[PDB]
Enzyme design. Structure first.
Site, mmCIF file in Angstrom:
data_model
loop_
_atom_site.group_PDB
_atom_site.id
_atom_site.type_symbol
_atom_site.label_atom_id
_atom_site.label_comp_id
_atom_site.label_asym_id
_atom_site.label_seq_id
_atom_site.Cartn_x
_atom_site.Cartn_y
_atom_site.Cartn_z
ATOM 1 C CG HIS A 182 -0.539 0.265 2.455
ATOM 2 N ND1 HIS A 182 -0.181 1.355 3.075
ATOM 3 C CD2 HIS A 182 -0.369 -0.532 3.520
ATOM 4 C CE1 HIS A 182 0.189 1.227 4.160
ATOM 5 N NE2 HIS A 182 -0.113 -0.131 4.492
ATOM 6 N N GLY B 220 2.131 6.277 10.298
ATOM 7 C CA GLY B 220 3.674 6.118 9.696
ATOM 8 C C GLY B 220 4.358 4.803 10.287
ATOM 9 C CB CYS C 193 2.434 1.174 7.607
ATOM 10 S SG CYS C 193 0.672 1.614 7.752
HETATM 11 C C1 LIG Z 1 -7.339 3.965 11.163
HETATM 12 N N1 LIG Z 1 -7.417 3.870 9.575
HETATM 13 C C2 LIG Z 1 -7.623 4.914 8.799
HETATM 14 O O1 LIG Z 1 -7.828 5.989 9.233
HETATM 15 C C3 LIG Z 1 -7.376 4.809 7.229
HETATM 16 N N2 LIG Z 1 -6.542 3.726 7.083
HETATM 17 C C4 LIG Z 1 -6.990 2.819 5.894
HETATM 18 C C5 LIG Z 1 -6.232 1.802 5.521
HETATM 19 C C6 LIG Z 1 -6.604 0.456 4.862
HETATM 20 C C7 LIG Z 1 -5.860 -0.438 4.674
HETATM 21 C C8 LIG Z 1 -4.600 -0.352 4.830
HETATM 22 CL CL1 LIG Z 1 -3.733 -1.888 4.558
HETATM 23 C C9 LIG Z 1 -4.229 0.547 5.425
HETATM 24 C C10 LIG Z 1 -4.798 1.693 5.840
HETATM 25 C C11 LIG Z 1 -4.150 2.592 6.588
HETATM 26 C C12 LIG Z 1 -2.710 3.142 6.403
HETATM 27 C C13 LIG Z 1 -2.224 3.656 7.689
HETATM 28 N N3 LIG Z 1 -2.962 2.804 8.671
HETATM 29 C C14 LIG Z 1 -2.674 2.974 10.087
HETATM 30 C C15 LIG Z 1 -1.735 1.932 10.436
HETATM 31 N N4 LIG Z 1 -1.523 1.490 11.861
HETATM 32 C C16 LIG Z 1 -1.718 2.274 12.619
HETATM 33 C C17 LIG Z 1 -2.670 3.525 12.272
HETATM 34 C C18 LIG Z 1 -2.956 4.488 13.560
HETATM 35 C C19 LIG Z 1 -3.629 5.694 13.313
HETATM 36 C C20 LIG Z 1 -4.171 5.885 11.687
HETATM 37 C C21 LIG Z 1 -3.677 4.918 10.790
HETATM 38 C C22 LIG Z 1 -3.156 3.855 11.030
HETATM 39 C C23 LIG Z 1 -4.020 2.301 8.119
HETATM 40 O O2 LIG Z 1 -4.770 1.865 8.883
HETATM 41 C C24 LIG Z 1 -5.078 4.059 6.538
#
Ligand SMILES: CNC(=O)CN1Cc2ccc(Cl)cc2[C@@]2(CCN(c3cncc4ccccc34)C2=O)C1
Ligand SMILES: CNC(=O)CN1Cc2ccc(Cl)cc2[C@@]2(CCN(c3cncc4ccccc34)C2=O)C1
Ligand SMILES: [Cl-]
Lengths: 305, 298
Positions: free
Chosen positions: A41, A143, A145
């Protein structure tokens, strides 16, 4: 004496963390030999996440679109490929700090250390378990990830997890190092929810054996139970079924303390019914399930108190 | 989201751990530049008299599979300093700092000069640490990281009869009224680190756990009268000042959060948990909460 949630020393993994940037997205990568592994991603915008076609996004990329930074040195990308949900970036320099390593896929109930990173820089290390619903209760901000989970039994690092996303309840989902997700999750922003979580029964039992080893027996009773009767009671408290494999695995701890697994199961049944009545077990007022039988043997003394 | 007991990455410290053997005793040492630091009990003890009988070759220092040659030795308080012929090429930027009770640090637990695990802990008000140490762990160190500098604050010396641990700063001065010898020693009555519990209540609010909040406030004096009855450390104006950033981020005044803590002490949690815990957690400082809820890297 003492019992702590202990993580593996993170040094061997710190020497592998890099920053990966593709356009406006920046996350962490794992640099092993001449390959950098990271969540696929990284090629997505926030809009792409609803219905991403990764093959279509990746075919529009060239090597020089990926910026890899190791400390203050820029690594040159010379190839790229996708394996399931991980992107593999071939770089021109092999990591001189590459440890002896393996990629292992873990099962629910297994524990591992997580090195949480931001911008290719490690910020902290903690211990956690793969929950029965395939999520992890981690501590990750945006951040993080590409941060990895691992075990270091002997001099070999076994990489078992790469962080990809956070679910609506605040728990986390990710893949093994071959890009296969743990759980029914997709690296897509769709209606995804963690399934109902349960307590890891074999781990609670292991931790009760650890309390006995460190000198505490207040929770024991004179009863025993059958495996079936224990499972009928346990499932009423959202505890995972205990299998014959679990009983076999607890054998060494049963022999060291002199308490049969089904006798420890009877204490667990009674603790679930009564609670703790102002008492604690190894400094905890809740039944702890993030220590496996193997972790208890590794941390605790061979001599029972 | 999420809140875990997080330790600093231990890599900079792993590259300093060595094994020190003197006769039949084997423990861990910290190799910084050309000096190895370790507990002096490696040698009713009169340490000056035991030390004068030892020569440099009596100390065996092992770094991985390489033998270091001891070329000098001296004692500083309860710490033995072994001058070696090779400077540690992996020496990080470092300082020796003495911490105060309530402050937290990471411990790299070692056996035979080899690191086995890392955990986070706090210096208790009674100067003990609730660690996880077995025989052979002596010389294991406690530290913090601030930017690229390792601040060494603890060296493990002994275990007390209750299972808690005692040690020194890196200058050999013990934390607490402890001595390095076999004699009747006991941990004093411990108290709860109040400023740390408040910081952890703010971390729970940041992570979306607000059931414990109420409309009430309290004075600093009234809160301290209540806290002293539950074996909680007194809360000072310095503690209130230190909690300022967390109070501004959540919109809850420190004395507002103190009123929530008072109600949790007088009434319990009533079957509820805060950040997955049924007890009030006191091993996260205000700075730890800020760092974990902001992503500070090293
Ligand atoms: C909480 N999720 C979102 O607001 C949107 N998110 C959709 C999404 C959908 C699928 C995939 Cl594989 C990645 C992602 C994101 C990429 C970054 N991410 C995050 C990862 N770890 C911790 C986090 C803590 C706070 C905010 C984001 C976090 C996600 O879940 C982004
Ligand atoms: C529990 N202690 C003893 O039985 C005797 N101990 C006397 C003694 C007297 C003074 C000093 Cl400065 C050290 C020591 C010993 C050296 C090692 N050590 C230990 C340290 N950490 C964890 C341990 C876990 C189990 C057993 C020993 C442990 C001690 O306290 C040994
Ligand atoms: Cl497994």
């Amino acid at each position: 004496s003492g019992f702590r949630k202990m993580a593996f020393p993170s040094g061997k993994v710190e020497g592998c963390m890099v920053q990966v940037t593709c356009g406006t997205t920046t996350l962490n990568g794992l640099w092993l030999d001449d390959v950098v592994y990271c969540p696929r991603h990284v090629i997505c915008t926030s809009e792409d996440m609803l219905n991403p076609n990764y093959e279509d996004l990746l075919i529009r990329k060239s090597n020089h679109n990926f910026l890899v930074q190791a400390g203050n040195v820029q690594l040159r990308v010379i190839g790229h490929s996708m394996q399931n949900c991980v992107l593999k970036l071939k770089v021109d320099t092999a990591n001189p700090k590459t440890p002896k390593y393996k990629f292992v896929r873990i099962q629910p109930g297994q524990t591992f250390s997580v090195l949480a990173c931001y911008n290719g820089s490690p910020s902290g290390v903690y211990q956690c378990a793969m929950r029965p619903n395939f999520t992890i209760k981690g501590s990750f901000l945006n951040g993080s990830c590409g941060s990895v989970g691992f075990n270091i039994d002997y001099d070999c690092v076994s990489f078992c997890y790469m962080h990809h996303m956070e679910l609506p309840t605040g728990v986390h989902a990710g893949t093994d190092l071959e890009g296969n997700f743990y759980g029914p999750f997709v690296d897509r922003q769709t209606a995804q929810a963690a399934g109902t979580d349960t307590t890891i029964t074999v781990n609670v039992l292991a931790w009760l054996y650890a309390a006995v080893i460190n000198g505490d027996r207040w929770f024991l009773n004179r009863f025993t139970t059958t495996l079936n009767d224990f499972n009928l009671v346990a499932m009423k408290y959202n505890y995972e079924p205990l299998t014959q494999d679990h009983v076999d695995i607890l054998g060494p701890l049963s022999a060291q303390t002199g308490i049969a697994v089904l006798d420890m199961c009877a204490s667990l049944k009674e603790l679930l019914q009564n609670g703790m009545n102002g008492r604690t077990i190894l400094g905890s007022a809740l039944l702890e399930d993030e220590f496996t039988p193997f972790d208890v043997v590794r941390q605790c003394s061979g001599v029972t108190f």
